[PDB]
Amino acid sequence: SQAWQPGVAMPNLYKMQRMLLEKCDLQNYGENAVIPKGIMMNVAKYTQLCQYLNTLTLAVPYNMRVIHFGAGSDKGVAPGTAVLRQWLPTGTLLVDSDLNDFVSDADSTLIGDCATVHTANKWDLIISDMYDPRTKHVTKENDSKEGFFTYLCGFIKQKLALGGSIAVKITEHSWNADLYKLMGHFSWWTAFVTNVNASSSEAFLIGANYLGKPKEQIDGYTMHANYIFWRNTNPIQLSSYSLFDMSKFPLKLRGTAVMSLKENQINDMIYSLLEKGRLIIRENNRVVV
Amino acid sequence: STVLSFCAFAVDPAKAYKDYLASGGQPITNCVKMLCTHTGTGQAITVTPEANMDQESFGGASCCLYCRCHIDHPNPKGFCDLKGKYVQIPTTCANDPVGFTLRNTVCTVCGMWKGYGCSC
Ligand SMILES: CN1CN([C@@H]2O[C@H](COP(=O)(O)OP(=O)(O)OP(=O)(O)O)[C@@H](O)[C@H]2O)c2nc(N)[nH]c(=O)c21
Ligand code: NA
Ligand SMILES: [Zn+2]
Numbered sequence: 001s002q003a004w005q006p007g008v009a010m011p012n013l014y015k016m017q018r019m020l021l022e023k024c025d026l027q028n029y030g031e032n033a034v035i036p037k038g039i040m041m042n043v044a045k046y047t048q049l050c051q052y053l054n055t056l057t058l059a060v061p062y063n064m065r066v067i068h069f070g071a072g073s074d075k076g077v078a079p080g081t082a083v084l085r086q087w088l089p090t091g092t093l094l095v096d097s098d099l100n101d102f103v104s105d106a107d108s109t110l111i112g113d114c115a116t117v118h119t120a121n122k123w124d125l126i127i128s129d130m131y132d133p134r135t136k137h138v139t140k141e142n143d144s145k146e147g148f149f150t151y152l153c154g155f156i157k158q159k160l161a162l163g164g165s166i167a168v169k170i171t172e173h174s175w176n177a178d179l180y181k182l183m184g185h186f187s188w189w190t191a192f193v194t195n196v197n198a199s200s201s202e203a204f205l206i207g208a209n210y211l212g213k214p215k216e217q218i219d220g221y222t223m224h225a226n227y228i229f230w231r232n233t234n235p236i237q238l239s240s241y242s243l244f245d246m247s248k249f250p251l252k253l254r255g256t257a258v259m260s261l262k263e264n265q266i267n268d269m270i271y272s273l274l275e276k277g278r279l280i281i282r283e284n285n286r287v288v289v
Numbered sequence: 290s291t292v293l294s295f296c297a298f299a300v301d302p303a304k305a306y307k308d309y310l311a312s313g314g315q316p317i318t319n320c321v322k323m324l325c326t327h328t329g330t331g332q333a334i335t336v337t338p339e340a341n342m343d344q345e346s347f348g349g350a351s352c353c354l355y356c357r358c359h360i361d362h363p364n365p366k367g368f369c370d371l372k373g374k375y376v377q378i379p380t381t382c383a384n385d386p387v388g389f390t391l392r393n394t395v396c397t398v399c400g401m402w403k404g405y406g407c408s409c
């Protein structure tokens with residue numbers, strides 16, 4: 001029954017622990033036996049991520065804005081962006097970025113370090129697949145990583161609309177304490193592992209319905225240790241069952257209200273709408289990235 | 290391996306790809322195949338995957354020789370008919386999506402590939 005799901009979300013029992021940080025006993029690289037012939041790993045992975053995102057209270061405005069970081073592959077193509085374009089409503093603004101050049105189906109493609117990416121407009125959904133390979137160095141010390149993660153925390157705090165959502169890739173060694181802490185500023189959050197890449201320590205930290213203020217106090221060092229503990233004690237068998245039925249794949253057109261409200265107008269009833277994915281708070285100005 | 294540079298540094302990139310294939314070269318790889326129902330309209334270039342039982346759907350820009358080679362498109366304004374869209378390619382020709390788009394034409398009335406799906 002778990003095999004049919006697009007993947008596995010970290011159970012609340014594991015989130016509520018206060019585990020010490022241990023090494024993860026899972027290996028990322030591996031001959032992937034469940035990816036169908038001719039399908040790239042990233043197409044299968046992003047497919048299952050969107051299938052999982054379809055179960056959440058995502059706000060889906062009429063003119064949705066989505067930014068995708070780490071969109072380019074070593075092959076020079078953007079398979080994750082291709083899946084996002086397939087999933088998102090037609091005409092959704094989809095902008096993608098990466099340090100090196102690549103070919104993409106996004107409306108705009110930004111080349112260079114993510115820190116160089118600047119916009120004055122707010123976004124409704126942020127997807128990230130960025131990974132620290134140059135530094136990497138698994139070794140023994142597993143401290144909080146800076147680099148793109150520091151920019152990403154600032155980006156979510158300054159440019160994510162209230163009601164908006166995120167899905168940010170992490171691994172045993174590629175993670176950040178402030179990112180986990182920021183997960184507590186959302187209506188709900190999870191660490192989601194795709195069934196096609198279940199042998200890897202990779203997961204997507206998904207934050208549903210951004211509230212712009214803490215709802216829970218999360219310690220990032222501790223929550224990463226909780227995440228590792230769940231992965232070490234709960235092996236997940238590789239599965240691509242969910243890829244064999246794409247009939248309900250597109251993101252449902254909700255026509256979610258977009259309003260530009262002042263802080264003094266954001267009250268309990270407005271927070272309740274944000275938490276149900278029934279509202280997005282931001283301006284509706286022309287987007288310049 | 291060097292097929293992209295081979296075509297990019299040719300006066301006629303489409304002819305270079307054809308000559309490269311005629312000499313035994315492997316077709317351009319890493320064309321993004323999508324997962325889909327295979328119950329679509331069957332049309333050649335669509336807003337979302339529209340493959341029928343006899344086709345595969347691919348991300349448009351990955352099947353474009355000019356996008357892949359990072360060179361000018363033959364269009365007057367420089368636009369691309371594939372980028373940002375999905376291209377349906379017959380399963381028998383899915384081994385070479387870039388070559389298929391270069392060698393084929395879309396029917397202006399039914400929207401299907403001439404000689405493959407076009408019934409007109
Ligand atoms: C997917 N969610 C979940 N969620 C919140 O968590 C509670 C339990 O939901 P859970 O996923 O655990 O499922 P269920 O209710 O069946 O319970 P159980 O699995 O038995 O624990 C739920 O009441 C919510 O407030 C939430 N919140 C916003 N905002 N958005 C989401 O998409 C989700
Ligand atoms: Na909302
Ligand atoms: Zn092109």
Ligand SMILES: [Zn+2]
Binds near residue numbers: 396401
């Ligand atoms: Zn015709």
